[PDB]
Amino acid sequence: AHLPKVAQSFLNLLCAQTSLTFSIVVLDEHEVVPVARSYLPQQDNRVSPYGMHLGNRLPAHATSTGKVLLSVLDREVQIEWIEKYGLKRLTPYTITDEHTFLETLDAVRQSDYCLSTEEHELGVIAIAVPVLNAQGLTIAALNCMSQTNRVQPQYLIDQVLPLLRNTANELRNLV
């Protein structure tokens, strides 16, 4: 796996500057799976939410990374994905309606980020951007997850998102 090796330093730099934990994530049928995580042993916050350790699996329809990665699929393939896997309720805030979900995928595709608040676990908020290769294929998603009582969405939008775009742009030529 070449993707984990290139990105490790970049994830560490994001953590060094924000103190949050960041991961790089791939889509595996209907779940998202981290293949790399930031790790700064001198300040490692072990109170981070579930889903960024290696081997963690989270539902794609209820995560920022999952929506980013589904948003690049053809609309028909999206329909087929929803009909196969469904949109099961995880929290009161999970998107469970097909029309709203497709609307969300379209906006995520157009906006190039997704901010998701408590849709797979209460108290957890996340923002994610796609990782493109040099050709423009979406190969992964780069994200940031935290507890809602530790980070405002304004901070994720105003401070974290610009740094994720900068990293993604540099990864583009290396992956």
Which CATH number describes the domain made up of 1-175?
A: 3.30.450.40
Instruction: Give the three-class secondary structure for 69.
Output: helix
Beta strands of the chain (E only): which ranges?
21-28, 31-37, 58-59, 114-117, 124-132, 138-147
Tokens describing residue 91: 């929290």
Separation of alpha carbons 175 and 159, rounded Å: 25
Angle at 32 between CA 153 and CA 57, to 5 degrees: 100
Separation of alpha carbons 51 and 57, rounded Å: 6
CA torsion, points 53, 146, 116, 144, in degrees to nearest 10? -60
Separation of alpha carbons 175 and 63, rounded Å: 23
Q: Indicate which technique resolved this structure.
A: X-ray
Rounded to 5 degrees, φ, ψ at 14 are -65, -40
Which residue ranges make up each domain of the chain? 1-175
Which helix (DSSP H) or strand (DSSP E) does residue 166 occupy?
Answer: helix 161-174
To one decimal, the resolution in angstroms is: 2.3
DSSP string, 100-140: HHHHHHHHHHHHS-EEEESSSSTTEEEEEEEEE-TTS-EEE
Separation of alpha carbons 152 and 160, rounded Å: 11
DSSP state of 62: G
Distances (CA, A) of 146 to 10, 22, 151, 159, 161: 18, 9, 7, 14, 14
Strand partners, 147: 124
Rounded to 5 degrees, φ, ψ at 120 are -115, -20
Tokens describing residue 158: 């105003």
Find out whether 38 and 14 touch, Cβ atoms under 8 Å. yes
